């Protein structure tokens, strides 16, 4: 599980969905997240995979707190398991929870060669649920940048070529209290392609400075 002192990620899910007919929908998951301790990774080995001026990962980690910084490696499933109808939905669903009511800002920077090409910013409002606070982003539609990228990768003949492109592709998710701008949760994403028919896999690491 991925949790700072202040906020916990419960679910993250990137997917495409197709309407075979008005009453029938196929949904394919690219990546999914749904309590062990975590192996550590030096944060200084990923500075080069994210923007590094002001608002950069180095200055974020230095601002603290350190209990907030994770790395997820995703084995993304890019199999055509659902028949490719044109005009399909490409979406991202995620849930967070906290003990305290707060208004959170969720920054999702898509990076190529350690440079921002897309930032998505969504403000989410606490909902009281079973004595805790929950934040739902439900079927947040993907940008054209990401849907094209997913098209480019699937039209490659060999998985090793996909993994070659993916080496230079990273996403940084930063969750802040809208008001205080206090860092609640930071998750660096790195990607390879899935080969096993077990499907999409993921590994979680703690980011440390040493
Ligand atoms: C890399 C191929 C598998 C797709 C993984 C995508 C995971 C997260 C979806 C992209 C987040 C950016 C949100 C967006 O599309 N626009 O802001
Ligand atoms: Cl997102
Ligand atoms: Cl309730």
From Swiss-Prot:
UniProt-annotated location(s): Nucleus
Expressed in which tissues: Preferentially expressed in the placenta.
Region entry Transcriptional activation, spans: 1-210
Function: Transcription factor which plays a key role in the Hippo signaling pathway, a pathway involved in organ size control and tumor suppression by restricting proliferation and promoting apoptosis. The core of this pathway is composed of a kinase cascade wherein MST1/MST2, in complex with its regulatory protein SAV1, phosphorylates and activates LATS1/2 in complex with its regulatory protein MOB1, which in turn phosphorylates and inactivates YAP1 oncoprotein and WWTR1/TAZ.
Subunit structure: Interacts with YAP1 and WWTR1/TAZ.
Protein name: Transcriptional enhancer factor TEF-5
Organism expressing this protein natively: Homo sapiens
Name of the gene encoding the protein in the UniProt record: TEAD3
